[PDB]
Amino acid sequence: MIDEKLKGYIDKRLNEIKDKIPDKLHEDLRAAIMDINGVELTEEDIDRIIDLTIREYQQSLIEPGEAIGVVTAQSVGEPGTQMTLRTFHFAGIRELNVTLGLPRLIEIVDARKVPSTPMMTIYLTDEYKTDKDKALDIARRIEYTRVENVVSSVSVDISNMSITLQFDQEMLKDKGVSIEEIKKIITKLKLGEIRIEDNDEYSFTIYFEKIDSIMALFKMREKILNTKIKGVKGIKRAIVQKKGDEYVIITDGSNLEGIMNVTGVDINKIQTNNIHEVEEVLGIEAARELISREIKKVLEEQGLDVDMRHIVLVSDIMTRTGDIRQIGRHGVTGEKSSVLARAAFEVTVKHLLDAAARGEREEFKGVIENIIIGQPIRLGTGIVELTMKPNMR
Amino acid sequence: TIDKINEIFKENWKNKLTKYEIARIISARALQLSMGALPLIDTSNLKSDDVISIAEEELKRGVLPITIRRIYPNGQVELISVRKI
Amino acid sequence: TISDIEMLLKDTEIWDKLLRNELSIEEAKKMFDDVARSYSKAD
Amino acid sequence: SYSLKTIEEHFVPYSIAKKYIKELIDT
Amino acid sequence: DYYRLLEDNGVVSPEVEVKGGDVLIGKVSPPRFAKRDTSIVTRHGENGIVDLVLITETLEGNKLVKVRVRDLRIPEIGDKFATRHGQKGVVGILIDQVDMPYTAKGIVPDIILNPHALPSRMTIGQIMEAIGGKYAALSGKPVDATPFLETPKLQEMQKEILKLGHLPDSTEVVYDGRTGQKLKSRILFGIVYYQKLHHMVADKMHARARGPVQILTRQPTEEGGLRFGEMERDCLIGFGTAMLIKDRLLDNSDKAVVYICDQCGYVGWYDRSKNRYVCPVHGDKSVLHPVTVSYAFKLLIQELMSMVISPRLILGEKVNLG
Amino acid sequence: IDISNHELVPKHEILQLEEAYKLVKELGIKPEQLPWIRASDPVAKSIGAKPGDIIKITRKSPFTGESVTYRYVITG
Amino acid sequence: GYFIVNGSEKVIIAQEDLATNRVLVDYGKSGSNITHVAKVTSSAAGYRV
Amino acid sequence: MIIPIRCFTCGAVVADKWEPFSNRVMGGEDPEKVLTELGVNRYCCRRMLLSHVNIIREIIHYTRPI
Amino acid sequence: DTRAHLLHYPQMPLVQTRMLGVIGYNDRPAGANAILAIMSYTGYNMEDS
Amino acid sequence: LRTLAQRLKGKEGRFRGNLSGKRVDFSARTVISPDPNLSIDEVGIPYTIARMLTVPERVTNINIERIRQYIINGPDKWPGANYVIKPDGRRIDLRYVKDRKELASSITAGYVVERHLVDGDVVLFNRQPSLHRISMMAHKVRVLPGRTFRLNLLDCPPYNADFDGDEMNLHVPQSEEAIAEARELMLVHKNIITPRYGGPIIGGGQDYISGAYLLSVKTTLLTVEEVATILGVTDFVGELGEPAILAPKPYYTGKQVISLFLPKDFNFHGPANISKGPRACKDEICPHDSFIVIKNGLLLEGVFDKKAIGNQQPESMLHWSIREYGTEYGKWLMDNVFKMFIRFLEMRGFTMTLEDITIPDEAQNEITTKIKEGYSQVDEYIRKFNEGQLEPIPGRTIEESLESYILDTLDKLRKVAGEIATKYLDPFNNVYIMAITGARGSELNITQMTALLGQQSVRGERIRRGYRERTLSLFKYGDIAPEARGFVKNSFMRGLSPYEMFFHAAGGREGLVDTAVKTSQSGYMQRRLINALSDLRIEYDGTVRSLYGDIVQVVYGDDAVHPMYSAHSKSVNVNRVIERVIGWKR
Amino acid sequence: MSEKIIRGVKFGVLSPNEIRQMSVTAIITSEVYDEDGTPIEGGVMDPKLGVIEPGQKCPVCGNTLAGCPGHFGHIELIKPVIHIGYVKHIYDFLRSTCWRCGRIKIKEQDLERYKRIYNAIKLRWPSAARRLVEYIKKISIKNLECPHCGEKQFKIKLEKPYNFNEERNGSIVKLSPSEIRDRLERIPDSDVELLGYDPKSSRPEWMILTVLPVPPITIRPSITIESGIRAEDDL
Amino acid sequence: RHALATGNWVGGRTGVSQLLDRTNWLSMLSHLRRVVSSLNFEARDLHGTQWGRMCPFETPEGPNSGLVKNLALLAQVSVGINESVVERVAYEL
Ligand SMILES: [Mg+2]
Ligand SMILES: [Zn+2]
Ligand SMILES: [Zn+2]
Ligand SMILES: [Zn+2]
Ligand SMILES: [Zn+2]
Ligand SMILES: [Zn+2]
Structure with a gap:
């Protein structure tokens, strides 16, 4: 209900003061005055509002000589005595176990190469985001399911020098890979001259020519069981979850390049728990942003509040040398020039x-x-x- | 002209006095008064005989002659007076 | 790896020379481009 | 607290040393 | 003065006031390698009365003497008390009978507990015990509160409490002692059992003025001083104070002055006989300057010098010069 | 593949030598005293950053909206 | 239930520990050549192996 | 140990009531009636008389020689 | 004893469990029944006081 | 054998035991006890501590006469002097002085009089482990009888101090410069707002909140005598004014009594903490006074709660008042108004009983019916799992799906039972008042004390440890019923069954060790961060370059705004300015 | 004689000449005390080293307990020994340069270029300078022939903590500390400077102990508990 | 005697014998009926097997939570018999 003359005066005063405040604070102030309604505004009220805003911003400024490093260190470390490992499961996924709290903050500030319980949030592209079935299919495509999981039973015979593999009908369907594909993969291994018989359905048997010692036979069996059928390396399980009009994939493994290579996933929005591979792939500024966001998330789940400026300063001092450097004796503390x-x-x-x-x-x-x-x-x-x-x- | 916020900071701290500089001025004046320097304000009519309180009141009045020289990182030096005549 | 350290040495020497105003901006830019082209050719 | 640096030092005048010490005694 | 109360046989007589460092048993020891005093000094903080004196002969034939000293502890502010449910707490204040809020029957509380201690701790057993104790005192019948089987139950206890003459819910009308005005609400009263813990404030005070220091590090201990430590040092840094850090870490502990040679930098000494400074390496030809540092730093320098490390301290003008 | 479109990656720009000279004169620092970014980092390689240059990076921050930071390009 | 040693009442606290002379099986550490471990503690007269 | 001279809550003498109350309760009379007719109606004194141990009877055997 | 404590007037609990008489605790009591009022009388009883 | 490289290595070495941290003089350590009468920037010390810990206080011509008195009183009488130092540097012990009056007449300028601590002296005060910056603050000495340090209750949050018998440390700074820096920088009232976030670290505890709420209820009415008794504790003398109710009987409303302390230009329109659930109307028209309306310094509507005067509450009425009127006004308001709150709670009556947590029999039967329905649903899930007809959640196994189903059903059962107990509960109970106002309570605590405990989980899962396929020998082999695996259907008022109590203990076992490990891990991490970040400094151009010269940030926080002076995370809360200007006519 | 501040500390290896000049006495007597308890001259508890008993004059300086900094002694080892704390550094010196001449096993022109680069950026980029130093060390270890001499070089292996084994013919031989000291002394100052060390402040031969400093009595006081007998520090 | 007075034991275990706590009756009884575990977050956890053998509440707070326990009211420690008689009866069965 602001008068047009009042709006013109507001614009004039704001353009007059625009050089004494930040652009975002100026925009916020301008938006707030226009929003006011239900009360009469006069010239003196607007002048007082602007003067008070400028004076509060000037009073809020930091002071030269402030020992901001120690203040930031204390502000980040003090909630450590209040951070607890109360929650063990990620969001509404009871199955997935994720560390998130004081140990997570310690491994963030320690720049550990591989985090405990790594995780990934994969966003589907615009084609596959709407439907649940395609999201489930793309999640099932990448799970790194080995032969040992699929096989119901393995039997070794010495006289025939044979290995019989027996599979479950439901468990084969759960993974979604056919037994013919498994046999094709085993042939692709081609570690020796092999004969394969169909034997029973959802089963088969393998014999060898130059098997030599039975120790070699058992080592060969261990190699066969530890063979990947499908899915990229490093991922244990992928679960489709709903975030509101869009379905994402929560992943128990971390492989940024492999997931980026998967068709049906946009490279632009991929979240990784670990900070080292994103630094290797997305550079150091993305690594710093992810470090700050992860620390903010860890402090948020505990429900306590820490200012974003301290987290920004910590993330800046971690990545000052062009790489994510450990805070401790091997890193920024290691090189004090003293x-x-x-x-x-x-x-x-x-x-x-x-x-x-x-x-x-x-x-x-x-x-x-x-x-x-x-x-x-x-x-x-x-x-x-x-x-x-x-x-x- | 490093950034707009830097200019705002620099023009803000020209006419104001930080709490570290206030504390340093008060401590220096108190140390001076303890050794035997003569106070500039009127000794009488003061509720507190403490040297710290006298130095604080002197700073509030502005009688004590102290100039703070702040050295900017680029070599610029700024002199700020406390006389407030 | 000696090429990288030597390039860092040359770049910091050029920057210190510029800070002393020995020569203008454009010549220093030519020097930077020349050293980068010369010692990235080896790599 | 006591850093002494001598610049443009001049020789002690033997003839004027008496005048200098008389001035010092006057002061 | 310390041997005033020591008897002729060398052991203090029973029922005498013992203050500070009075001696209780007078013993003289010949040197192991001319008498020396190994006599017992009562602890400096502890003050009390000698309660018992005992003299015996040990198996190997040595005289054994024991002296037991008693000290009366009256509860005060800061003494720790705890109930049978896990409600530990110091005594906030001691309040006279007149000031405490009395009831219509005139019964004043012995202990007042803040209700806000109950709901977060979820100790319903404390209120149940209060009601049970009130019922036990009123009716005189025994109360059994064994878990999973209590005799009598809560409802019968409340009914009997009502029968004896008090309110069934264990509350009762309370008047403010100071002003005499009745409170707008009733106040629960009970007879909860309390225990006095041995963490008294009498023996939990440690305060140090200027005193002795260690022979090696020249730092104060034994009354010993409180260790400042890294975390408090960082708090002082965070406030930005500099002279306060210097006071708390240099002035009040291991404050030392050392004379350092200009050229080599090794720590020298002042000779009392001749005013000239002396350098361990340079002899007399070099000039030495005094520098005020912590004695711990000098000890570190000398310990590094006992190694093959050779720290050469570089002096600089105390003034800003410019 | 192009990574500059990722949400985590801020806006990287290579500023001219005159702007770098003005920046280092106003800050009163040697160029190596700035926080430095490796020339092999993919974000620097995408814009073709060369060692000895200064990279202007605009990040999205909730306090000012866009924040300008300067990085130094080092060798490996 | 307590001894009197050198005039002081000393009591031997009960000490709880894994049963000796029995074999306990457990999985080996993940990501290692060891897959299963069984440990047996034989308590002899005067020594333990 | 020995019964207090006065009730802790209210300064009422309960020491002289220990012998009659204890003797009559030990005789086979319920403590409620004995307390009521003895002259203690406030439960602050009742808890003083009811919850007493009389340790002093055992201690006189183990007394310090002094 | 090197460190001994004595409560001059200890009282057996009014609210007693079955096992209190078995262990002889009511013959060697370690406290006293206190008339307790659950109220905020002055403010010196805050924060577990 | 310990050698010269082991002397300065490890704990208790030269580096940490001596160089990094050393024992200090003029320090005391004593148990703390509450004291609401002292100001926030005051600490109560015993007489012995004052007598033994001294201050140099070099003699000057201004304080000479006062100093003379300190020498007339000996070392034993307070206030007095313990030592006197001539300008020649010769120390003299006042205890052995033949005549103190003749020495007192002799002193002049230049002397030093090591004297007992007097009221107003500034001393550093801290509680271990001294985590954050304000854990060590400068307090003004007040000497009181007793033998324990007395700390104001409002100072409990900054020190994380609660009165269990945990002690606290007091250091007396000797140098004049040290005293001046302590006073001008580390005074308690100057550090009311924590640097971690833009919010007040000092504020109303649990009892202050209850007192303020009960004083600010719309129904409270106070006579002239009651108002005088309430305002006696405060240091307020002035015209009371006409009572809010003039006829039939003169009555002062609690809001009217409160409004005498608010500044005459102060506008606030925030909601109260009681408007956190169904009773909230999100407007200033609610019949329940849950919307705080203050115009021109008059508490016209609403009640004070944790969201109005509570500690650690950013963007609260107290936080805005402090930010707009200075920390000195903040301290004045705290002292006077909070003493008034405590006095009113004293004279009204606040207690804890069993009636306010006891639910009626009908509520218990309804909770039992809900419990039976949940048990039947879980049994149906178990039957479907055994029969193989259970439909798993995609991406999960059968056992995981069954466990998720059971846990979700039991959680919903606990929530429903809590809602039923709250609905059947009295509208305004002392426990309810504590919970809703934020005064040491929570909804879960109400549910567990009244409705039922719920599922007890160890390490995030149901109680599984025990015999084979049994968590306990009391149950049948392979039983997956809710009651078997750590689900308690009994509240604390009703009492727990033996196995229920065992499961509750098993669930609660974890915290006892988690706190201990967390303390050490947090200390180690904070030491690492402090040692890494110690060198940074804010310069005069806004940069955050280190002391060695390396620049870290061109601008601190992108707007050069310290978190201490920012309104929560915002440099300027524009809506707050709009309120400050046009709130009276809003 | 003016009060000053400490600008910094110059760290370095204490040369034997400095140890001999700084020491106030040479310790030659094994015994510490006498039969009557009076300390013996020239022993470990030499009163010249320092004073710890209050009220006792120090022979060297004449100061009381307060004001006596403590005076060092020295013992002359008959055979040189390897300082444990520097073994790694000594190791880095042994394999980098040949025993024949002590020059770095690198071509002279490459040595000149490396020296120029290091001197240019030894202080501007300490990390880059350290990387250059480790690269020079790696390429010096890799080369098994001295360009200056041509003498065949034998791989030197360090068995913890201080054992050096040289591959002479087909057999391992233990490198005597005296021979190691000779090899280190043959190294020039410029080569030491190139390897990241400071030749003036520290010399490789100084890492082999010819003279051992005896710490003053002040830092190893003899504490005598009243009940117990005189106790001596482990040092 | 040297083993009982000092408490340092022959088998390498430490703190076998402790001076009896006599602050009151309860401390003495508890200290008599105390079992200390020689040895993890799993071991500190309360086990369902502890029913009727160890007190679920009595345990220290801190590093010893769950490692120091008190014998239950109706808990008996086995004394033991010779293995030969049981072997003979099992073979005869
Ligand atoms: Mg406490
Ligand atoms: Zn010298
Ligand atoms: Zn009574
Ligand atoms: Zn409402
Ligand atoms: Zn000497
Ligand atoms: Zn050679």
């Missing part, structure tokens, strides 16, 4: 002896070693230096 702080972080003598051998000198530009000897630090009150003229007092 010797005393390095030797004090973890109690070791090897670093002092290494520095002595290399002839390295400590510049004492940091904080940890300044406290050790006794000189003041350069954070907060340290950054400010005063000049006084006592003559005119």
